[PDB]
Design a protein around this ligand. Sequence first.
Ligand SMILES: CC(C)(COP(=O)(O)OP(=O)(O)OC[C@H]1O[C@@H](n2cnc3c(N)ncnc32)[C@H](O)[C@@H]1OP(=O)(O)O)[C@H](O)C(=O)NCCC(=O)NCCS
Ligand SMILES: CC(C)(COP(=O)(O)OP(=O)(O)OC[C@H]1O[C@@H](n2cnc3c(N)ncnc32)[C@H](O)[C@@H]1OP(=O)(O)O)[C@H](O)C(=O)NCCC(=O)NCCS
Ligand SMILES: CC(=O)N[C@@H]1[C@@H](O)[C@H](O)[C@@H](COP(=O)(O)O)O[C@@H]1O
Lengths: 180, 182
Amino acid sequence: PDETPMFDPSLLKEVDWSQNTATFSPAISPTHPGEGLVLRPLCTADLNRGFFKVLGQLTETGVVSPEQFMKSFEHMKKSGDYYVTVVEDVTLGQIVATATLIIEHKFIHSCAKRGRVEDVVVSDECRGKQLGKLLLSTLTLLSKKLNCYKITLECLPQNVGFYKKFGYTVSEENYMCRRF
Amino acid sequence: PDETPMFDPSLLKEVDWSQNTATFSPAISPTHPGEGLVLRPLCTADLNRGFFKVLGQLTETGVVSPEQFMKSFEHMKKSGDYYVTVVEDVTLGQIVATATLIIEHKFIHSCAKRGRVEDVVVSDECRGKQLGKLLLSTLTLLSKKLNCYKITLECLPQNVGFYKKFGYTVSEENYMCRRFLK
Ligand SMILES: CC(C)(COP(=O)(O)OP(=O)(O)OC[C@H]1O[C@@H](n2cnc3c(N)ncnc32)[C@H](O)[C@@H]1OP(=O)(O)O)[C@H](O)C(=O)NCCC(=O)NCCS
Ligand SMILES: CC(C)(COP(=O)(O)OP(=O)(O)OC[C@H]1O[C@@H](n2cnc3c(N)ncnc32)[C@H](O)[C@@H]1OP(=O)(O)O)[C@H](O)C(=O)NCCC(=O)NCCS
Ligand SMILES: CC(=O)N[C@@H]1[C@@H](O)[C@H](O)[C@@H](COP(=O)(O)O)O[C@@H]1O
């Protein structure tokens, strides 16, 4: 594991924060996430900073080997299409929040790009401290900057009001699943 | 534009068709999609086989240069994660149906893979020929074969009964969208 980021950290900096609509108090931003905190791409050393401990609060992570993580990480990085983003408490050296933006390429809408928000979770001790809003507003604006024609996500009905804060609305389409 | 497929066509013969749950009458399969038809990966030469005319029946699919199409194709090919699959009517040399399987990589569920079914459309003159069922069944089984832990898709409630035929069920989760075009 090293400090190589999954994607160019500047992409987070250069998001047009003027387009944010979510309310912050105090007014944190991608460049100013809160003292002692950094908002950045996942890097391979994050395996040892409790990345999986955070993800484990959302759903099951099973047993993951360093080699398994490295291979997944390298594939994601190589694609250019995966924006796994974390908030790290630098004083503790621990990940405290994560969210992923995935870019999908299509042929419809003039060879469009489409965004998906995945795997959004704030560590329990850090909930209600604006990090979910920060992650969501930053990644949503990043997809618009990357020329996505739309961005989508799925959530339980109890979380709908949260995502509304970044301009998401409930689609008429149903989400259908088959589990193997 | 050439005949090179987006993915290994062998993968379509390796789908365990005995696991298909949808009812077909007449019996057709990935191997035998019907007389005059071939189910196969997209290739760049499909640009000139009416590929976009089919997509245009799904949603807006406007102006695209040959180089833009080839760039998207190569990018999709290079990832190994895109399975844009077509049915061609060989007598006419025209695409008559398309569906895409995308493989998404995760860190959850022990660094799992999950499938997405996207951009499913049969040309209206070929509907009721079981080509939509063929594509859905094949891609669903292919995702299983590729060790996805699940596969998902979104559709208007008006299409729910179609996807039920392949073992999909309506999830409790809401689908949410921010449209940057309107
Ligand atoms: C808790 C969670 C949903 C929100 O993140 P958070 O950091 O705790 O929330 P924030 O402090 O960033 O934002 C708080 C704001 O969102 C609102 N909010 C929080 N949860 C909400 C919900 N479920 N529905 C509607 N609004 C919600 C609060 O009222 C507050 O509103 P306001 O500050 O605008 O007045 C977070 O994303 C999380 O990890 N939760 C548990 C795992 C999870 O459910 N992940 C999402 C999978 S879809
Ligand atoms: C029309 C479409 C959805 C299905 O393809 P098709 O050629 O009509 O269907 P097939 O001949 O392969 O399968 C026919 C079966 O599916 C059923 N079916 C077709 N459309 C259906 C729908 N919208 N809802 C429920 N069932 C449907 C038929 O009743 C028939 O049932 P049966 O097998 O018991 O006889 C097709 O994929 C299409 O291009 N439609 C318009 C574009 C579109 O909406 N794409 C899907 C977006 S989520
Ligand atoms: C299974 C399936 O085919 N689902 C499609 C989706 O894949 C496609 O991208 C979208 C286009 O509609 P849009 O132009 O409004 O984004 O329609 C449906 O939701």
